[PDB]
CSV table of C-alpha atoms in Angstrom, one decimal:
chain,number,residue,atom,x,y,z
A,26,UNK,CA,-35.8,2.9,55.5
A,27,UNK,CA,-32.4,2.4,56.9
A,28,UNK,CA,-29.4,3.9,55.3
A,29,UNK,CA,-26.4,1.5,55.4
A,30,UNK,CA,-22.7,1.6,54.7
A,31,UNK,CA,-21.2,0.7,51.0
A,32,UNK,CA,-19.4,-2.1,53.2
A,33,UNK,CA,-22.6,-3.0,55.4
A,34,UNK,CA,-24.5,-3.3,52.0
A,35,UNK,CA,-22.3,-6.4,50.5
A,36,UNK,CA,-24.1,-9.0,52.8
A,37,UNK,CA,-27.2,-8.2,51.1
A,38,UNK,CA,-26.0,-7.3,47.5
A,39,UNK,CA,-23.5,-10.1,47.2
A,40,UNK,CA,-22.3,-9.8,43.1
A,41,UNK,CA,-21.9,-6.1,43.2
A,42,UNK,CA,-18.1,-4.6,43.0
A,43,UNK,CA,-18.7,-1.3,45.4
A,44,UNK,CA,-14.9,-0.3,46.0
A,45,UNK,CA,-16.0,0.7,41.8
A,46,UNK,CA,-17.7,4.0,42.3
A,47,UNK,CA,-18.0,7.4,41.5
A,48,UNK,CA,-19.7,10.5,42.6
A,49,UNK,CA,-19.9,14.1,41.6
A,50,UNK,CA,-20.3,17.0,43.7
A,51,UNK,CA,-21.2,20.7,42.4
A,52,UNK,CA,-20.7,23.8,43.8
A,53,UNK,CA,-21.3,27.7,43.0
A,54,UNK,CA,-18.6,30.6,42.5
A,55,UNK,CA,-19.8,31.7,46.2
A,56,UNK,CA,-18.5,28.2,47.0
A,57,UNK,CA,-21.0,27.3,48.3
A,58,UNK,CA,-22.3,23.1,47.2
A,59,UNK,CA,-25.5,22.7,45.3
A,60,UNK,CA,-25.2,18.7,44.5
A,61,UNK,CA,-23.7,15.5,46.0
A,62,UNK,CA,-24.9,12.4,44.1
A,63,UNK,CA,-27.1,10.4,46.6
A,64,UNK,CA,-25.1,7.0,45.5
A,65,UNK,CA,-22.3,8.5,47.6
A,66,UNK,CA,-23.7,8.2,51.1
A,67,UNK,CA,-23.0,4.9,52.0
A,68,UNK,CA,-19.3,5.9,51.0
A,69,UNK,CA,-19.5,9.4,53.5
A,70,UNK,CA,-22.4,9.4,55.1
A,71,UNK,CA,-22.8,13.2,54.3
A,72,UNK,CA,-26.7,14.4,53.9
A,73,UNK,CA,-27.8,16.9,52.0
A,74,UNK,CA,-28.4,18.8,55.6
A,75,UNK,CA,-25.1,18.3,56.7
A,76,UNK,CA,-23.9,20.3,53.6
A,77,UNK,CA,-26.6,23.4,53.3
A,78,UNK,CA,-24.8,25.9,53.1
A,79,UNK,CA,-21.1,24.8,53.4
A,80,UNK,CA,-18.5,24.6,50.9
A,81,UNK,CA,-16.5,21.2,49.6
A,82,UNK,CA,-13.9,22.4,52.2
A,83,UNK,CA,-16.3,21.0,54.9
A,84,UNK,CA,-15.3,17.6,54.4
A,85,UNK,CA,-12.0,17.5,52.4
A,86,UNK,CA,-9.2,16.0,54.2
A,87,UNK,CA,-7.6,19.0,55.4
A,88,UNK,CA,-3.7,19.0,54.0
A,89,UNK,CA,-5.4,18.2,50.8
A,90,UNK,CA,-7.2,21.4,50.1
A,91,UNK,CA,-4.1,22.3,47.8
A,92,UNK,CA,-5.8,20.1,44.8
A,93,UNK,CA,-9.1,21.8,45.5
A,94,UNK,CA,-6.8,25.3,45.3
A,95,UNK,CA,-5.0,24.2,42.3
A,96,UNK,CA,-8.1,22.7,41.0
A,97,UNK,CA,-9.7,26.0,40.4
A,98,UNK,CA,-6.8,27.8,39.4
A,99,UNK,CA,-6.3,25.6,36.2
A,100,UNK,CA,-10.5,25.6,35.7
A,101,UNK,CA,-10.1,29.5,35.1
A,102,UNK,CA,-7.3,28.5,32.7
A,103,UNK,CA,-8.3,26.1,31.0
A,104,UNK,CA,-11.7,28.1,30.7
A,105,UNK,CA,-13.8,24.9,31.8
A,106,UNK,CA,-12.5,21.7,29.9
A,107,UNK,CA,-11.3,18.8,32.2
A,108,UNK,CA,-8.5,19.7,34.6
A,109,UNK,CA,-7.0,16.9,36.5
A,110,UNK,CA,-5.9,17.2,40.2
A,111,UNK,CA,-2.0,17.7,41.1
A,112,UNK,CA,-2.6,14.9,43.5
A,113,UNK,CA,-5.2,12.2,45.3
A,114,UNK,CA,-8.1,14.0,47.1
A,115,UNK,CA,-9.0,12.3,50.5
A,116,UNK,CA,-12.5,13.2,51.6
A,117,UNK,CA,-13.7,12.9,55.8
A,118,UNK,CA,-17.0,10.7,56.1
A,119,UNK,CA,-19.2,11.6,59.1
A,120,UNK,CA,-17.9,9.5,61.3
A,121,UNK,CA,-14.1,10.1,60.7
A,122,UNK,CA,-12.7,7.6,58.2
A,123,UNK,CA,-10.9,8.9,55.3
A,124,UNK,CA,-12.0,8.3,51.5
A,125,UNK,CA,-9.6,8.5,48.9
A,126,UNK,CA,-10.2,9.9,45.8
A,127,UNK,CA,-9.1,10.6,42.4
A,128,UNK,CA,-11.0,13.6,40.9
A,129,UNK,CA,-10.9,15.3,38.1
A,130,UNK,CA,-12.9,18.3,37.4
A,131,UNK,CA,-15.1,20.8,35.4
A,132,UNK,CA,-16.5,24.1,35.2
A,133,UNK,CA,-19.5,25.9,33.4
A,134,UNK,CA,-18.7,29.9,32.5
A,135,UNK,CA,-21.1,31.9,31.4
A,136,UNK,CA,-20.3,33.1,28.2
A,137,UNK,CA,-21.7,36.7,29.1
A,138,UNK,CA,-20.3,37.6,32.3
A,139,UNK,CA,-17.2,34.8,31.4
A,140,UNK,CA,-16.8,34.4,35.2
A,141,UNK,CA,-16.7,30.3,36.2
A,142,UNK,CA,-20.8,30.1,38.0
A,143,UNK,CA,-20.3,26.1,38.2
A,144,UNK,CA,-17.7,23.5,39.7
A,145,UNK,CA,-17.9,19.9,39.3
A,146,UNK,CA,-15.6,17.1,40.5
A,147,UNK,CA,-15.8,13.7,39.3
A,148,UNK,CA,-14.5,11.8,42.6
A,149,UNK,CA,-13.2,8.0,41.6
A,150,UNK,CA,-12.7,6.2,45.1
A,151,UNK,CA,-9.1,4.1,45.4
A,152,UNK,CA,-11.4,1.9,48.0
A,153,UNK,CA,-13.5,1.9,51.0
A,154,UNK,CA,-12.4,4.4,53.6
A,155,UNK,CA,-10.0,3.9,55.9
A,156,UNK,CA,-11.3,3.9,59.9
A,157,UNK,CA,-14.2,2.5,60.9
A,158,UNK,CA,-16.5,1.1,57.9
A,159,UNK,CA,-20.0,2.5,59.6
A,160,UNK,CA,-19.7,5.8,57.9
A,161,UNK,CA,-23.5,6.4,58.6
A,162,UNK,CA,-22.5,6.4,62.4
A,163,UNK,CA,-22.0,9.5,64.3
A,164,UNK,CA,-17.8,10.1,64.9
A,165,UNK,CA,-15.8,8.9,67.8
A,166,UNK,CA,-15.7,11.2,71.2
A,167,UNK,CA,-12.1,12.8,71.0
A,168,UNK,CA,-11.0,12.5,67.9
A,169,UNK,CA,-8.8,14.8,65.9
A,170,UNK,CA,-10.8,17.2,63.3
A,171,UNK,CA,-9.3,16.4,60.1
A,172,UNK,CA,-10.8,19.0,58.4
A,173,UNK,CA,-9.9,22.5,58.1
A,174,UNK,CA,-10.6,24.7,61.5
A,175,UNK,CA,-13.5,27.5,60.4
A,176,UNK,CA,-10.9,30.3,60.0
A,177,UNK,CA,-8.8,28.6,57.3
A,178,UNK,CA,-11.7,27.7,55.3
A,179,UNK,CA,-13.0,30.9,55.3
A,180,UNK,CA,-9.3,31.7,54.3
A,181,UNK,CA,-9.1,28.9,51.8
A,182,UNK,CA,-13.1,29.7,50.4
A,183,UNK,CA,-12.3,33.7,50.3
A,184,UNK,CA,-9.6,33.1,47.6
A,185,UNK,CA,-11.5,30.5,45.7
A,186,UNK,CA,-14.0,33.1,45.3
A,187,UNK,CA,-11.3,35.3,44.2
A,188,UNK,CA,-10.1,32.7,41.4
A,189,UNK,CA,-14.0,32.3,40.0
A,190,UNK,CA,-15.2,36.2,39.9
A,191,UNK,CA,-12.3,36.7,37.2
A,192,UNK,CA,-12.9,37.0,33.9
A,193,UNK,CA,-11.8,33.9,32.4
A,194,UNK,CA,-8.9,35.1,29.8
B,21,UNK,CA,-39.7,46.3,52.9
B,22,UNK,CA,-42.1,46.9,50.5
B,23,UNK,CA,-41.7,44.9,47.0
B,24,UNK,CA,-42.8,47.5,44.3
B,25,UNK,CA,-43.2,47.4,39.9
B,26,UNK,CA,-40.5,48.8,38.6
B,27,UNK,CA,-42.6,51.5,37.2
B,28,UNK,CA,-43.6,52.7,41.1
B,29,UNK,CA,-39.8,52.5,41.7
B,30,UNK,CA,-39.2,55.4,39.0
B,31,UNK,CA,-40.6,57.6,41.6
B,32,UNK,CA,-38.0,57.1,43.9
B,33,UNK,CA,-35.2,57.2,41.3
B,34,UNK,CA,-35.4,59.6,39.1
B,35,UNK,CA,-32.4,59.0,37.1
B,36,UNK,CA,-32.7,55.4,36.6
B,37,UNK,CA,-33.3,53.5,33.3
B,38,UNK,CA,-35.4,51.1,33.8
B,39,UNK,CA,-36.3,50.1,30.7
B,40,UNK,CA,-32.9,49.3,29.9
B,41,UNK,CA,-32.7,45.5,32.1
B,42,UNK,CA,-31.5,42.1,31.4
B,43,UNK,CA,-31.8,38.8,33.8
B,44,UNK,CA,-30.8,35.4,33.8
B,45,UNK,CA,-32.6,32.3,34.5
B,46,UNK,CA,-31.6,28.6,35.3
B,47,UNK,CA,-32.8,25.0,34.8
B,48,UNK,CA,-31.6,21.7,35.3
B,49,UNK,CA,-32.4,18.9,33.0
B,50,UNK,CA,-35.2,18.1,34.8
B,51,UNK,CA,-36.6,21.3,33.7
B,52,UNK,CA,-36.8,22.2,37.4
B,53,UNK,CA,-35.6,26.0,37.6
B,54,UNK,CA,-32.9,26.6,40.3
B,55,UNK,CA,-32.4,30.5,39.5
B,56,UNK,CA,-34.4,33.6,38.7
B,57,UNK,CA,-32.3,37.5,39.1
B,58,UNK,CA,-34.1,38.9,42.6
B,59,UNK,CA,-33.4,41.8,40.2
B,60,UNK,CA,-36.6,40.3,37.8
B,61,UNK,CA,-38.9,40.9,40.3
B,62,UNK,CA,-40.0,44.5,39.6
B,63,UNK,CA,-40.3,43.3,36.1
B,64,UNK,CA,-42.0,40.3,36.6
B,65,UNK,CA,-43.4,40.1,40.4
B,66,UNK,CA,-42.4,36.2,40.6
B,67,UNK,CA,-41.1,35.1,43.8
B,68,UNK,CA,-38.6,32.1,44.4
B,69,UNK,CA,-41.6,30.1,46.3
B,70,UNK,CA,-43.4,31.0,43.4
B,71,UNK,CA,-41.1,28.9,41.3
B,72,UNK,CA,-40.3,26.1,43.3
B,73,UNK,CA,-40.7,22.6,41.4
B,74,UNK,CA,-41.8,24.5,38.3
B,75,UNK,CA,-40.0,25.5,34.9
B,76,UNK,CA,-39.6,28.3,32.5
B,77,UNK,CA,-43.1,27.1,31.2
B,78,UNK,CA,-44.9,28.1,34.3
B,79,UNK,CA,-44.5,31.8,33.0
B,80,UNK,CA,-43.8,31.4,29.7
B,81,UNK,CA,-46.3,33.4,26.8
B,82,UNK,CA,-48.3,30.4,25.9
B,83,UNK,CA,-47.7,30.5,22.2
B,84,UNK,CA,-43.9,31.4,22.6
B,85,UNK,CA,-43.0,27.8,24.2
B,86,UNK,CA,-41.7,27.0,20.3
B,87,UNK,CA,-39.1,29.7,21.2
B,88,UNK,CA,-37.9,27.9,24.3
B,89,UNK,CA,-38.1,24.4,22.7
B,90,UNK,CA,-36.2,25.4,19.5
B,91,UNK,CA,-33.9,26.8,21.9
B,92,UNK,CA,-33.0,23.5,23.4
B,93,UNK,CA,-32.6,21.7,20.2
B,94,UNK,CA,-29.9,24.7,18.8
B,95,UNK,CA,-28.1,24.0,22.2
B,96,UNK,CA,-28.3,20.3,21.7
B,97,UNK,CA,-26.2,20.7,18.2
B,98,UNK,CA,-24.4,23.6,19.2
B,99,UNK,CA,-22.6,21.8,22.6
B,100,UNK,CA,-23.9,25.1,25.3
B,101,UNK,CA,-22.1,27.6,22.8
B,102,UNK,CA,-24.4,31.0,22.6
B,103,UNK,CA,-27.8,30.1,20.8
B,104,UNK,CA,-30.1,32.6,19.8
B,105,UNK,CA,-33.8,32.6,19.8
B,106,UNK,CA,-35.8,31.9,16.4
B,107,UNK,CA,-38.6,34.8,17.8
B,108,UNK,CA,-38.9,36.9,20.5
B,109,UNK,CA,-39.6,35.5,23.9
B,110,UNK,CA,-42.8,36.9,26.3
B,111,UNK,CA,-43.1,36.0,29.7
B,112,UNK,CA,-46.3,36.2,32.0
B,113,UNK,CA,-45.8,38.2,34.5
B,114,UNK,CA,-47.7,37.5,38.5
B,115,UNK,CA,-50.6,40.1,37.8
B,116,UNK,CA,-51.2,38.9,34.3
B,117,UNK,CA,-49.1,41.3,32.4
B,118,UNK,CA,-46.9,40.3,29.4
B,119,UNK,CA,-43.2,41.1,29.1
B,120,UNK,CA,-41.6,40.6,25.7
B,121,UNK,CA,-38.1,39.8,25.9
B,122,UNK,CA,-35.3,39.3,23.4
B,123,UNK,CA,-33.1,35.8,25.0
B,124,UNK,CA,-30.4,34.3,24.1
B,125,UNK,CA,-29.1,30.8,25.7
B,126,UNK,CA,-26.4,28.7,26.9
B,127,UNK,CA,-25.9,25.5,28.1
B,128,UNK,CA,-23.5,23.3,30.3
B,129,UNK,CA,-22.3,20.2,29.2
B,130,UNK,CA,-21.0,17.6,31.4
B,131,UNK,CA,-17.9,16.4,29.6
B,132,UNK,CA,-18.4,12.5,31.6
B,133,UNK,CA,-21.8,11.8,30.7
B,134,UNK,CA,-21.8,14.2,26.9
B,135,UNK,CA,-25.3,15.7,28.5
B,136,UNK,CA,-26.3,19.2,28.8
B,137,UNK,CA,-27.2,19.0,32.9
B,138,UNK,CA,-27.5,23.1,33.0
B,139,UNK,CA,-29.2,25.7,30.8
B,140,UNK,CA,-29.1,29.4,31.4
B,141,UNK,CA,-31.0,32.0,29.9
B,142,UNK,CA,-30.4,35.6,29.4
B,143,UNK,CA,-33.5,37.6,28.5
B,144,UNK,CA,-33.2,41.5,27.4
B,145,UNK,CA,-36.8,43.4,27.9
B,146,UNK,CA,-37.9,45.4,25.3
B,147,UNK,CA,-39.9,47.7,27.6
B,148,UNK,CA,-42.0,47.7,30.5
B,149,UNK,CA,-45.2,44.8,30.4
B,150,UNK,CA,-48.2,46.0,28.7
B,151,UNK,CA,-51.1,45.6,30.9
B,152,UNK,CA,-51.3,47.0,34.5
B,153,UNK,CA,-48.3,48.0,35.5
B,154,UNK,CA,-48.5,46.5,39.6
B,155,UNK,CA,-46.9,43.0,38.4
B,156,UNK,CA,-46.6,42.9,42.3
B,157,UNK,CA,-50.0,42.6,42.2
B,158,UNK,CA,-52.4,39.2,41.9
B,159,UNK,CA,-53.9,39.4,38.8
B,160,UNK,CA,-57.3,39.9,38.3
B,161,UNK,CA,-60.7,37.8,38.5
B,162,UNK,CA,-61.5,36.7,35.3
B,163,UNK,CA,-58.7,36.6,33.0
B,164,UNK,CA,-57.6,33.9,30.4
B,165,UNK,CA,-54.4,32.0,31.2
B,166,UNK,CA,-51.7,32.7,29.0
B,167,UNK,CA,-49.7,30.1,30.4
B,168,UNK,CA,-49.7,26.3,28.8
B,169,UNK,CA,-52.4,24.3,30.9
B,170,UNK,CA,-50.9,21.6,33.0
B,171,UNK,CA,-51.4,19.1,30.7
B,172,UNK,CA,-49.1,20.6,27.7
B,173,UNK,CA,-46.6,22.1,29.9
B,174,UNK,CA,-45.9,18.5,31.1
B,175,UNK,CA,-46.2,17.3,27.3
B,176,UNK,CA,-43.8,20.2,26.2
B,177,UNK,CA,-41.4,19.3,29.1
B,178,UNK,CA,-41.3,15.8,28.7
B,179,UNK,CA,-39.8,16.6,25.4
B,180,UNK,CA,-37.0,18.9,26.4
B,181,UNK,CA,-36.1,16.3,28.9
B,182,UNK,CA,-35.7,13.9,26.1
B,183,UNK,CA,-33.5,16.5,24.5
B,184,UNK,CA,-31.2,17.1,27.1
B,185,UNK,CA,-31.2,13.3,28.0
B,186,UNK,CA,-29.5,12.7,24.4
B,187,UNK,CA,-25.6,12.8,24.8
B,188,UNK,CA,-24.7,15.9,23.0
B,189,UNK,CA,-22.8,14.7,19.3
């Protein structure tokens, strides 16, 4: 079974609209991510081995960690109900190209600890990535990492982590 | 490292109140389980490979799953607010032994689709398991399941997926 790109896939599915799409992602208050939706693959080309064991912060685009930041700081106040992000999210597919997003996002707390113990984002796509469309492909040699560099997410996830083991007010 | 009952543990801590205990489990809406306590297992003896692919009904008191079904209809109408059991709740423990356990329940509600994707579980013991008290232990030769056969479990499961496939009112 090959896996193709939403682009690659048009030539064979030839009535369906697939820059309409969205995708959720779920992660844990350790950070760390317990569910991408399948469907999203030919729009990042992340598997679920490219993701045991790492955070959202793997992949986000990496000045835009802010609305992932600010995401979670309005979760624990608005004690789980829809929060909407302060700005776009841009995602990095494997092989580079950036996906746009527009995300809004949730949060489960347990009503006996009343720490936040789930994250999800709803990601809405603005289009198709920009970069190369072959998202499934491996990235360029000598490219720029447009993620953040392992310190600053281990920066970015220690105060996330923070944020979730508070009681929510 | 030895794994040992929490009866043997009293041994070794002689102040300790083991009778006093509560744990948490986790399922998805596929039933599937996706958390146990590590802290269950001198009270049950259940591993996490034990658990793998299975649900709360592959330990569950036989004649108690009414408890857990009930359980996911109050969630249902009450939208993951605190539910609490209609009776108390016994669990099979690895060797055999039975654990009764007072539970109450939550629920996660993704606020896209209106469907409970998450339920949680917190279950208070009411004392140590009556029977041999090694739930480390396999359980012996020769004793009756307690535990829905295959074929009911998969019967009772197929209805709480139904349930938690209902958008919530």
């Amino acid at each position: 079974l090959a896996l193709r790109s939403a682009f690659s896939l048009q030539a064979s599915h030839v009535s369906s609209n697939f820059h309409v799409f969205t995708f959720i992602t779920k992660h844990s208050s350790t950070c760390a991510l317990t569910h991408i939706d399948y469907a999203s693959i030919p729009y990042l080309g992340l598997l679920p081995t490219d993701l045991i064991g790492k955070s959202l912060l793997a992949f986000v685009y990496s000045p835009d960690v802010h609305v992932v930041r600010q995401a979670h700081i309005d979760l624990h106040n608005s004690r789980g109900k829809i929060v909407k992000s302060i700005a776009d999210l841009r995602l990095v597919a494997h092989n580079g190209s950036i996906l746009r997003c527009q995300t809004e996002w949730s949060a489960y707390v347990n009503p006996w600890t009343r720490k936040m113990e789930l994250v999800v984002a709803r990601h809405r796509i603005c289009s198709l990535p920009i970069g190369d469309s072959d998202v499934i492909s491996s990235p360029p040699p000598g490219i720029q990492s447009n993620t953040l560099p392992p310190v600053m997410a281990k920066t970015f996830e220690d105060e996330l982590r923070t944020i979730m083991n508070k009681p929510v007010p």
